[PDB]
């Protein structure tokens, strides 16, 4: 009855899609199935997935799908009685988590060669181990936190100062300038935001992003592919190492 939280109505131009987006994704995959020769399945497990836009542009030959795992499972067809081609139900067995689809016409070996060759450095994301022990120096703090040498650096903005205190650094303002201990230096030690071999909390990941310190690699792992002409699926070293359902 009463004693309830008041929902805030949003005076904004975008609203929830709901049913129409789900059937649009169903229909768009449905017309994509006959047009291409191979359906590759891939996973980006704990990446930030902002560079998937870049692999969209330079691979204009193929069609790429990345949405709800359950929706792509039925769009391909989990049951062998409801499927649009033979062997699609075995392709749905790889659809477990953050999993996308790749409808391509080119060589299967060319796709694997390119995805192994691509490598980009990205931000850490929560739950990862830390490859480095990084530390902000004792005195004036800067935009990068000491990754670049400070003579080529720029002092960090004063707007960021309440956020750094919220995320856990004891940071104060002297003369309009954001610093850690004293402006000259000393009077404290540096702040360690991560240690080697430590699981990165989301507080630490937000601190590394703010200084633009990157500790993770964005990569795309191909699980397997299905050939339209052949009719069965194959796996390459990624289906063995990951649970399937």
């Amino acid at each position: 009855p009463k004693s309830k939280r008041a929902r805030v109505y949003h005076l904004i131009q975008v609203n929830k899609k709901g049913r129409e987006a789900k059937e649009r994704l169903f229909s768009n995959i449905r017309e994509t199935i006959p047009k291409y020769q191979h359906c590759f399945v891939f996973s980006v497990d704990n990446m930030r997935n902002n560079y998937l836009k870049d692999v969209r542009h330079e691979l204009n030959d193929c069609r790429i799908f990345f949405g709800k795992t359950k929706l792509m499972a039925r769009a391909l067809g989990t049951t062998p009685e409801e499927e649009q081609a033979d062997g699609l139900h075995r392709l749905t067995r790889y659809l477990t988590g953050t999993v996308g689809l790749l409808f391509t016409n080119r060589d299967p070996a060319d796709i694997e060669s390119y995805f192994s060759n691509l490598s980009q450095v990205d931000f850490a994301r929560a739950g990862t181990v830390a490859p480095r022990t990084v530390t902000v120096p004792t005195g004036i703090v800067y935009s990068t936190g000491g990754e670049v040498p400070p003579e080529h650096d720029v002092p960090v903005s004063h707007t960021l100062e309440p956020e750094l205190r919220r995320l856990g650094m004891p940071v104060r303002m002297i003369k309009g300038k954001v610093c850690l201990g004293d402006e000259k230096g000393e009077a404290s030690e540096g702040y360690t935001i991560c240690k080697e071999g430590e699981v990165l909390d989301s507080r630490q990941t937000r601190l590394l992003k703010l200084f633009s310190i990157c500790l993770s690699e964005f990569k795309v792992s191909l699980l397997g592919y299905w050939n339209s002409a052949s009719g069965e699926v194959t796996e390459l070293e990624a289906g063995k190492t990951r649970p399937k359902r």
């Binding site: 109505y9 005076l11 131009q13 609203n15």
Partner: peptide, 30 residues
Amino acid sequence: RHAQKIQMRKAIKQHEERNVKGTAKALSSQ
């Protein structure tokens, strides 16, 4: 609080209309 709820429900209805969609002063002052 009665007047605020009238204003906020007018704001909801005007927004819902505008988001779904894609003389007496002159006579007196003369």
